Nucleic acid binder design. Structure first.
Lengths: 299, 300, 183, 162, 183
DNA sequence: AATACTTTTATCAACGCAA
RNA sequence: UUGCGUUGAUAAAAGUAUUGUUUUUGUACUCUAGAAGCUACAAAGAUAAGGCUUCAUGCCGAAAUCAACACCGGUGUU
């Protein structure tokens, strides 16, 4: 007997209700809410992942302190001089003897700046030019050369040479840092015998260790809802495995892969049906006999 | 004009507490100074671009003593204003190179940036490190809600203000709340007496009702925030029908008229006034309250 | 307690310990000095025993916890009964000794209820100092709404640029390792 | 094996899915390494996607497909809160955040109005998802109600008159 | 703490509780009223917040223990944050409630360290009142020379003419049986 | 507090084959 | 309305790298081994205020959810 009406907008709905036999207003109202901005979730997500990066850098330094204190090299970490040049000790310890405290300085500075690992487009051209330079030296030699030639070391900065101008950058791959750290640790192993091979495997695990993009955050006893160690007690294998969609008619079943026998025989059947003997004949022919193709199927 | 409105309330508690930018202050004498004062510093990021020269000449045509090099290295500033006489910094760069400082020889450092005394210190959070010498702050501190108190021995209202950064993760169990002693400090600063009765608390887009005592008038507002934190009880309000208060529009007798900008920054800490809170339905049925509970909600 | 010149020295010491500019303190609501009158109070001019009761109690309430005023009374009882203490050290050094004796008794008797945290202090203009001091409490003596009956208040004077860690076990280990650097 | 090779994209995920999901599989290392190089060889073909159907319905249907020339929608034709209204459909079907918000606040308005006054027959909205939602709720609740798809209050009053 | 009119009512209540003639109290050394000025203070004339700091601190130090002033501060924090307490009961009744809550927590958590005794109070003329109050302390919190850090102070309002027994077990049983008669 | 890279899952549109 | 094959737009979540801001210290620049803390370069600490336990490829903190109160997914009123 009554008629409802709604005017839907971006941040408002106007609403009314009438009777239509008399035509008097039974109710009218205006409901106002703020808009659904997607810029705030982008801000929140960006800040969360930046906080994770800062956390994991500090945890690498903490793990290095624990490794250096457990193996008994240095007792306390308050008398360490912060006014020594780390690149000079990093290039010196490749052939000479580091005095047990400059070794900690060199390894801490090396674990503070590791490298990129997606490589294994101007930015690509600059990092390939830098790789074309590092094929004969370690990156510590490159950084010390830039330091004692131009004064600057860090950032991205341009230098005018005698006849040309090139912009320099501080980006090296992780393999070069790992090779340099392995060389320094083998030379100091030849000098100082407290650095066993398990120290070198633990330090290289701290240096080149990264997570996988399908793992996420968390640990076995850390229980994150953003990572594979779910907070319900279980453990996923790949976190994009619970995001795969449902079926179209039974909304509780996982989908199938497109690249198996089942979906492919279903697709050939759906293109063939718009009888049974030559259905099976064409299907076993395409299944078992090779050098196949669409023009070959029409032939 | 018998239409009813219905707004949505904003009562979330953990939002952006401040900027993440770390500022620097100095104590100096700038302008009309009879004592030292704390000044937030600034920086021209690079002077050879188009923006850095414009910012430099803006500061220069405002006041010359704002630059820190003007007070700590004067002859280098003389060799900075010899180029600006005859041309600018980009032309000096494309002929002679980087603008080095004053020295005996050509071996001083280059000049790419310049700091100055930007502004005076307002709302902040003191995040000064342990072994530091000047103050270090965080700016842009936002407000969250208001608690309205009322005492009988004066017969007028007093108004608190809580920010997002007044709450904390606590030290034994990790809960998000504010203590009672810090709340007593916030009550003391805003001028609330100890023996006042807590009436209610106001969030943003919460419907306020102002009634008078001598001439029986009624006005209805939306609350926004707790502006002007130098003198007390000032509240920023917004209309109920529209989104703005443009003009010198009159509201009721005892409040006055809106300013020339369009902002309604009133002082509700006065006698001859009365406040209710309106809690609407989603269809607009205004229900009026006078007492919320016994104590303000402090644990979340 | 007893109000005398030793309380004036203790007040000026703890003000110089927690606040870094003096005008953050002497303009607080309830205290409310003026610049000439603050210079009169600081430089020995005004006798502390004939001032207002509410002003001196507001200064002591800002600088000290509620358990710490009780410990001030007990150290005043013990201090004025010995010539070694009265003729060798000032009163704020003996109050520091009394406070660390109570902390060591807490760590010995019941180590697994000692909690701690970062303390926050409001200035005269409404803006707080984040990380003004270190709070140390006993978790068994809780009243409710984040209040503790037995609670003390320290400040670290370390020379290293590493902060106090979070978590119960890590902060307890930091407190046990740095027992000469806090004061 | 198609699931494990489609979802995982590099060596350790492939390896531990083949070692961990195939219960008592006892696969060798040689075939694991050659499946790693095989997945590395075809990324454009094998990382195609996921089929929109499930293996339960398709194992219901692959034998049946053969005996008759019949199409899928006609084959599936041939095989075939207690008073208030749900938030299921309005939280699932999200086209934009703005559309999701506005339609769910409007549906709260709708169900408050149907709680207050009573029954209805004509509902007007100034698309088809909300339409068949309301139409199936009203048929399932045995109510014949036809749903059809200052200033905004006046405009809603005007289209309620229209 | 905070000094206001509620502290004046609390002072007059506890003076009427421990001393039986008022001129035993207002002529003590450090307090030192005169008869006209005591009638000015008592009958509402003089505001307590602008008096001397040492005199009000001497009155509070005579009537209360050192732990009890801390409990006054904590009850003042909790009292002015609630309209039920602020508009129903005066402050000395809520201070009594706070004090008995702390005593019940002591008896529940650690019953075998609660000791007690008979308290003795000096008048203005040097002669003491024997058995002025009942002292209740925790024996674990001893400082030395007969001082305890955590100590409270009660008065029995029983109607029977039997005294409190001596010995640890007998006095603990009396305290547990008469928990509504002490105040 | 911004700029460079890598990857996954899902949804709308529109361009066709069929119903 | 439903499935398949192309290519645009979007959303949600994950892993990394290099700076930026800021504090101390050192070196240079300046004024007489001291001082000023401007202007550069390099180390080390912090990076929304903070907080947790399991002791680590550790974890959480800037979004959305919304009128309150009483009695059996429902039920009553200012």
């Amino acid at each position: 007997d009554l008629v409802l009406g709604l005017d839907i907008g971006i941040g408002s709905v106007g609403v009314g209700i009438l009777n239509k036999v008399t035509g008097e207003i039974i109710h009218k109202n205006s409901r106002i809410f703020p808009a659904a901005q997607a810029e705030n979730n982008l801000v929140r997500r960006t800040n969360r992942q930046g906080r994770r990066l800062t956390r994991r850098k500090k945890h690498r330094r903490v793990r290095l302190n624990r490794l250096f204190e457990e193996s008994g090299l240095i007792t306390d970490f308050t008398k360490i001089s912060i006014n020594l040049n780390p690149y000079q000790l990093r290039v010196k310890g490749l052939t000479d003897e580091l005095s047990n405290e400059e070794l900690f300085i060199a390894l801490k500075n090396m674990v503070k700046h590791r490298g990129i690992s997606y490589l294994d487009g101007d930015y690509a051209q600059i990092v390939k030019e830098n790789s074309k330079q590092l094929e004969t030296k370690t990156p510590g030699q490159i950084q010390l050369e830039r330091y004692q030639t131009y004064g600057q070391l860090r950032g991205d900065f341009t230098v005018e040479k005698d006849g040309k101008k090139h912009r320099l950058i501080n980006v090296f791959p992780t393999s070069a840092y790992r090779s340099e750290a392995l060389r320094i640790l083998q030379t100091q192993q030849e000098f100082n015998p407290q650095i066993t091979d398990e120290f070198i495997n633990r330090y290289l695990e701290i240096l080149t260790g990264k997570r996988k993009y399908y793992h996420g955050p968390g640990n076995e006893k850390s229980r994150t809802d953003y990572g594979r160690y779910r907070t319900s007690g279980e453990t996923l294998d790949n976190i994009f495995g619970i995001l795969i969609g449902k079926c179209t008619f039974y909304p509780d079943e996982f989908r199938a892969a497109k690249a198996s026998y089942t979906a492919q025989e279903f697709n050939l059947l759906n293109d063939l049906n718009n009888s049974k003997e030559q259905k099976n004949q064409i299907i076993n022919y395409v299944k078992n006999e090779k050098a196949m193709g669409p023009a070959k199927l029409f032939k | 004009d018998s239409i009813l409105f219905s707004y949505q309330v904003d009562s979330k508690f953990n939002r952006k507490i401040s900027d993440a930018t770390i500022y620097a202050t100095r104590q100096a004498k700038v302008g009309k100074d009879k004592a030292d004062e704390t000044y937030v510093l600034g920086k021209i990021k690079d002077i050879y671009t188009q923006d850095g020269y414009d910012a430099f000449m803006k500061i220069y045509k405002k006041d010359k003593s704002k630059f820190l090099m003007y007070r700590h290295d004067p002859q280098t500033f003389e060799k900075v204003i010899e180029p600006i006489l005859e041309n600018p910094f980009l032309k000096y760069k494309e002929e002679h190179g980087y603008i080095r400082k004053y020295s005996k020889k050509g071996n001083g450092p280059e000049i790419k940036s310049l700091k100055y005394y930007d502004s005076k210190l307002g709302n902040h959070i003191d995040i000064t490190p342990k072994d530091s010498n000047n103050k270090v702050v965080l700016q842009s501190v936002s407000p969250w809600r208001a608690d309205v108190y009322f005492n009988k021995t004066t017969g007028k209202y007093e108004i608190l203000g809580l920010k997002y950064a007044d709450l904390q993760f606590e030290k034994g169990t990790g809960t998000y709340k504010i203590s009672q002693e810090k709340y007593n400090d916030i009550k003391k600063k805003e001028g609330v007496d100890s023996d006042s009765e807590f009436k209610f608390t106001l969030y943003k887009n919460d419907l306020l009702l102002v009634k008078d005592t001598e001439t029986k008038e009624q006005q209805l507002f939306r609350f926004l925030s707790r502006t002007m934190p130098k003198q007390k009880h000032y509240v920023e309000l917004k209309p109920y029908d529209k989104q703005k208060f443009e003009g010198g529009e009159a509201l009721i007798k005892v409040l006055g008229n809106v300013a020339n900008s369009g902002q309604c920054k009133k002082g509700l800490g006065k006698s001859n006034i009365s406040i209710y809170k309106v809690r609407t339905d989603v269809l607009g049925n205004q229900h009026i309250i006078k007492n919320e509970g016994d104590k303000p909600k402090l644990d979340f | 307690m007893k109000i005398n010149d030793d309380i004036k020295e203790l007040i000026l010491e703890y003000m110089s310990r927690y606040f870094k500019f003096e005008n953050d303190f002497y303009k607080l609501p309830g205290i409310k000095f003026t610049d000439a009158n603050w210079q009169k109070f600081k430089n020995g001019g005004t006798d502390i025993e004939k001032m207002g009761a509410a002003r001196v109690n507001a200064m002591l309430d800002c600088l000290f916890d509620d358990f710490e005023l009780a410990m001030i009374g007990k150290a005043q009882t013990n201090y004025y009964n010995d010539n070694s203490l009265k003729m060798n050290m000032p009163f704020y050094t003996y109050y520091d000794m009394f406070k660390k004796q109570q902390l060591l008794k807490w760590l010995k008797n019941n180590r697994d209820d000692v909690i701690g945290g970062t303390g926050r202090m409001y200035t005269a203009s409404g803006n707080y100092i984040a990380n003004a001091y270190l709070e140390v409490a006993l978790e068994s003596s809780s009243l409710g709404s984040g209040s503790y009956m037995l609670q003390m208040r320290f400040k670290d004077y370390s020379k290293g640029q590493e902060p106090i860690p979070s978590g119960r076990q890590n902060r307890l280990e930091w407190i046990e390792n740095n027992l000469e650097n806090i004061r | 094996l198609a699931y494990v090779l489609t979802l995982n994209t590099e060596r350790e995920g492939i390896q531990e899915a083949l070692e961990h999901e195939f219960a008592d599989g006892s696969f060798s290392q040689k075939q694991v390494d050659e499946l790693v190089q095989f997945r590395k060889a075809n990324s454009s073909i094998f990382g195609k996607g996921w089929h929109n159907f499930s293996v339960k319905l398709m194992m219901e249907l692959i034998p049946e497909l053969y005996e008759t020339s019949e199409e899928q929608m006609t084959i599936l034709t041939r095989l075939g809160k207690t008073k208030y209204i749900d938030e299921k459909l309005l939280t699932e079907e999200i086209y934009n955040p703005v559309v999701a918000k506005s339609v769910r606040q409007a549906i709260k308005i709708v169900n408050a109005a149907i709680k207050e006054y009573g029954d209805f027959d004509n509902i007007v909205i100034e698309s088809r998802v909300v339409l068949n939602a309301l139409q199936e709720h009203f048929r399932a609740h045995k109510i014949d109600t036809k749903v059809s798809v200052h200033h905004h209050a006046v405009d809603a009053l005007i289209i309620a008159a229209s």
